[PDB]
């Protein structure tokens, strides 16, 4: 059984650079060897097969090379669109084994986000329920810090994070931050913040409403 | 090539579940087709194959006896017809096709996959409400608004925004499974602040295994 092991698992190219992506075999697979491109949400799409033969419609940037245990994909002058994981597949042995894949990031110039804050609206009100959103928009790097404060309160265990794939057209990040709280504590406070800290903001961005001014 | 999947959704451990896949645009009776599959936030491993004529089949270890691939080359259709279906079966299955050369194993085209989920939880719609700001702003020039998905099983969802004509900064956030065992995710738009009384913005949500559809006004 020939296993693949792509390591490393992440890297990280600036756009119009370098990436180079290694996959390894525990066998010899000769140069039975393919590579696939698997965009977010999207099924993979073959690139190279033959180790280093393209498929058909494949940008001349994508490049492979290596026979029998060692194999490399380089991806020559890196575009935004290339923002995806790519995949290693063998088939000496039908009908073959795929490799752990190694997800490319692109290296895009410092982001900050846009924050905005979003009460509960007055239809969950009504449902019994109760939660504030956060939104930090369009940012890179994805590092971010998310910090709640419920009438200057500092919060801490009750939010709830979920942050987008790297965008394929300007390779930033987006991520919500959800405060979990009961409608009942929700109409206890007032004043509802978000204060986020990014490596593009010289001092930390709040955002924030008074419960009784919406 | 088109190879479209059908047939995924919640299914109960124990269940069974008939996938299939429609293909479309080649000469579908001369290749062999597979099943492959990706676990959430997993990678790829193939889980079938079938011979061109239907004669030769091969199954991944931990799926033989419980999964039958078949196909229909007068409609041009492979199935899998999955049994005795445990969580660890719970994954996206794409068809995929072998090249048809010297051989060699090469999944050239899939599918867009259908995901199959094996659990016991059962089937709820969402609840859709609109995310607006507390109050008017007087000094950004772009605005945020967006829709609150909430407490929905299984997945997937789909969002879109004024029925697909708004897709520019738009971000459909992945669900999130709480410790209730329900999904909540959250769609947002940013759009010119100038916009938020001429322009009218609205999320359609679908989710197709509870056959609930919400178009939600935002603002």
């Known amino acids: 059984e020939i296993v693949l092991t792509q390591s490393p698992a992440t890297l990280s190219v600036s756009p119009g650079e370098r990436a180079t992506l290694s996959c390894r075999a525990s066998?010899?697979?000769?140069?039975?060897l393919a590579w696939y491109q698997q965009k977010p949400g999207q099924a993979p799409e073959l690139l190279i097969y033959?180790?280093?033969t393209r498929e058909t419609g494949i940008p001349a940037r994508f490049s492979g090379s290596g026979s029998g245990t060692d194999f490399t994909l380089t991806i020559n002058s890196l575009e935004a669109e290339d923002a995806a994981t790519y995949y290693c597949?063998?088939?000496?042995?039908?009908?073959?084994?795929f490799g752990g894949g190694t997800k490319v990031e692109i290296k895009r110039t410092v982001a900050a986000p846009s924050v905005f804050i979003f009460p509960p609206s007055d239809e969950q009100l009504k449902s019994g329920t109760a939660e504030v959103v956060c939104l930090l928009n369009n940012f890179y790097p994805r590092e971010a810090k998310v910090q709640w404060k419920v009438d200057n309160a500092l919060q801490s265990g009750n939010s709830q994070e979920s942050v987008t794939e790297q965008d394929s057209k300007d390779s930033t990040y987006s991520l919500s931050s959800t405060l979990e709280l009961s409608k009942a504590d929700y109409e206890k406070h007032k004043v509802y913040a978000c204060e986020v800290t990014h490596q593009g903001l010289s001092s930390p961005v709040t955002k924030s409403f008074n419960r009784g001014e919406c | 090539v088109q190879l479209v999947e059908s047939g995924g959704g919640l299914v109960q451990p124990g269940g069974s579940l008939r996938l299939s896949c429609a293909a479309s645009?080649?000469?579908?009776?001369?290749?062999?087709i597979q099943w492959v599959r990706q676990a959430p936030g997993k990678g790829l491993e193939w889980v079938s194959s079938?011979?061109?004529?239907?004669?030769?089949?091969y199954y991944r270890r931990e799926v033989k006896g419980r999964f039958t691939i078949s196909r229909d080359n007068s409609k041009n259709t492979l199935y899998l017809q999955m049994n005795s279906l445990r969580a660890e079966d719970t994954a996206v299955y794409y068809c995929?096709?072998?090249?048809?050369?010297?051989?060699?194993?090469?999944?050239?085209?899939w599918g867009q996959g259908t995901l199959v989920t094996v659990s016991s939880a059962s089937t709820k719609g969402p609840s859709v409400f609109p995310l607006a700001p507390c109050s008017r702003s007087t000094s950004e020039s772009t605005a945020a608004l967006g829709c609150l998905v909430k407490d929905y099983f299984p997945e997937p969802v789909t969002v879109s925004w004024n029925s697909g004509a708004l897709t520019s900064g738009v971000h459909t956030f992945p669900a999130v499974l709480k410790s209730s065992g329900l999904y909540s995710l959250s769609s947002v738009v940013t759009v010119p602040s100038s916009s938020l009384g001429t322009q009218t913005y609205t999320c359609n949500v679908d989710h197709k295994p509870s056959n609930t559809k919400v178009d939600k006004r935002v603002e």
């Open positions: 645009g080649f000469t579908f009776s001369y290749y062999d």
């Open positions: 597949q063998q088939y000496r042995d039908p009908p073959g084994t």
């Open positions: 033959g180790a280093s």
């Open positions: 066998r010899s697979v000769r140069r039975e």
């Open positions: 995929a096709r072998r090249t048809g050369r010297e051989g060699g194993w090469i999944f050239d085209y």
């Open positions: 079938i011979s061109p004529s239907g004669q030769s089949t």
